């Protein structure tokens, strides 16, 4: 079993970088007739890899679907990868590292990259909200609502 103690751990960011950029505007020439903020639909995937020993390379995938009315406006997908040299963590701690924390570092860069390609496609402004992967990860390990059943009784 996981017979490791002492909350020390260590990693250093070796490299942050975009691995993939995508922007498909299929209706673009015609859809510009509709001057409006196209309805945003978010997608998020997270991958990792082993380059060398203690050297793990996490890939954050963000995909943004958008449409003016009932027809597509734009489709902008970015994959912000990152090399991190991790040690000390294991079990729940390593699942928190590569499954939440490592994507959460890459997230601002993935955001600016999406907005760049939307700007290049001459579509309205796109700013994605900060998703705290680490907080929602803690809730994932239980898959249930928070327990704080009390009786203040203010009347």
């Amino acid at each position: 079993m996981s017979e490791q103690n002492n909350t020390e751990m260590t990693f250093q960011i070796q490299r942050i970088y975009t691995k993939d950029i995508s922007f498909e505007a299929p209706n673009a020439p015609h859809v510009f007739q509709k001057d409006w903020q196209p309805e945003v639909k978010l997608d998020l995937d997270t991958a990792s890899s082993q380059l060398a020993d203690d050297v793990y390379e996490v890939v954050l995938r963000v995909t943004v679907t958008a449409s003016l009315g009932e027809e597509t406006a734009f489709l902008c997908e970015v994959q912000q990868g990152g090399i991190f040299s991790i040690a000390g963590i294991e079990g729940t701690q390593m699942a928190h590292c590569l499954g939440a924390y490592c994507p959460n570092i890459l997230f601002p860069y993935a955001r600016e990259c999406i907005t760049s390609m939307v700007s290049r496609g001459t579509f309205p402004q796109l700013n994605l909200a900060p998703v705290n992967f680490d907080a929602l990860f803690m809730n994932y390990l239980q898959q249930q609502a928070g327990e704080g059943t009390e009786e203040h009784q203010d009347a």
Binding site: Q37, L42, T46, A47, S48, A87, E90, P124, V131, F133
Partner: peptide
């Protein structure tokens, strides 16, 4: 090598809101 995840393709991101398209 020291660790290894299932490689969560399916995430857990939930939000009762949107971007706020004004």
């Amino acid at each position: 090598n020291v660790v290894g995840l299932t490689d969560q393709t399916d995430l857990f991101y939930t939000m009762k809101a949107a971007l706020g398209l004004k």
